[PDB]
């Protein structure tokens, strides 16, 4: 029959080759994902149509900050074929309440906290 899929823990154990291809650190990892749905929930089972509603990814190509914790990551492991996961990197820090209204999330995955529309 067609059931849900238990993906083994070996698949989510990154190799030291993988830390060189994608620019991640094993020690001190990132805190917040940027989840973006890139596939439809149609022609997918109902246990994936509801997980996508649980993460807020009902719209395609709309990013969403989620924590990098093993309970949010258990939901992202169900629908990893539907989404695209990238780390939210913060070149400057998290925005204060003065820099809250001048932020922008870039396509590199970084959240700049001062966003003028002037060239360098």
């Amino acid at each position: 029959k067609f059931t849900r899929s238990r993906i083994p823990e070996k698949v989510f154990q990154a190799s030291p080759e993988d830390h060189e291809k994608y620019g991640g650190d094993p020690q001190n990892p990132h805190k917040l994902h940027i989840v973006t749905r890139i596939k439809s929930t149609r022609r997918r089972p109902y246990w994936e149509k509801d997980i996508i509603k649980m993460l807020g990814l009902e719209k395609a190509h709309t990013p969403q900050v989620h924590k990098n914790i093993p309970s949010v990551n258990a939901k992202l492991k169900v629908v990893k074929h539907l989404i695209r996961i990238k780390p939210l990197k913060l070149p400057q820090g998290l925005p204060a309440e003065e820099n809250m209204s001048n932020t922008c999330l870039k396509s590199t995955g970084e959240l700049v906290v001062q966003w003028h529309l002037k060239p360098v």
């Binding site: 067609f2 059931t3 899929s5 993906i7 997918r44 089972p45 994936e48 074929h81 539907l82």
Partner: protein, 205 residues
């Protein structure tokens, strides 16, 4: 007795209860009788199938025909036909029970040895009549040695290590990468894309 003994159409006491067609004794790699025991040359099964009594008479007559019993011997590796296959009587409508037992059948999976040969003889004297028996079998078959069986197995081990394709079938199926387990079987995780039904793709990694 250096000849293939007589294989009977049915057991001595016959099966009285009609068994369902477990077709899963054809699909997948074989586990019983995959290696050589007191022999040198054999007939490998490169695909699954059912041996009727007619195939056993083909193998028994046309191995004992072309043979030196003073220099060669042969043993069976497949059993006598035991699984009952029930045909309904001809020209009947559908339903009304299950048909009566007509004949018996051995299941043979892929990678199974069928007959074995031996004696003071090399392979070229044996590739003659073992490659003509292998062509009459209902599955794709092959005459193998002990040296050419372990060559074709160590070759596929070298195919599985050399390939520049970053994606294999096991990496994609066991991880459920594109959600691809919606179109695969649960058997395809241990089949790894090399077995499709009764058939066997040996060029596939």
């Amino acid at each position: 007795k250096p000849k293939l003994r007589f294989i009977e159409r049915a057991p001595l006491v016959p099966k009285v209860r009609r068994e369902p067609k477990n077709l899963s004794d054809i699909r997948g790699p074989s586990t019983e009788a995959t290696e050589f025991t007191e022999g040198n040359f054999a007939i490998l099964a490169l695909g699954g199938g059912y041996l009727h009594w007619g195939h056993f008479e083909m193998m028994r007559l046309t191995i004992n025909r072309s043979m030196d019993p003073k220099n060669m011997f042969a043993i069976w590796r497949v059993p006598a036909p035991f699984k009952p296959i029930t045909r309904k009587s001809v020209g009947h409508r559908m339903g009304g029970g299950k048909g009566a037992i007509d004949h018996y059948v051995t299941p043979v999976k892929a990678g199974r040895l069928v007959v074995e040969m031996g004696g003071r003889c090399e392979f070229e004297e044996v590739q003659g009549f073992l490659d003509q028996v292998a062509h009459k079998l209902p599955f794709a078959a092959k005459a193998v040695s002990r040296g050419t069986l372990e060559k074709m197995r160590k070759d596929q081990e070298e195919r599985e290590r050399n390939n520049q394709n970053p994606w294999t079938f096991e990496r994609i199926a066991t991880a459920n990468m594109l959600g691809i387990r919606k179109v695969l079987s649960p058997y395809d995780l241990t089949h790894k894309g090399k077995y499709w039904g009764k058939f066997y793709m040996p060029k596939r990694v």
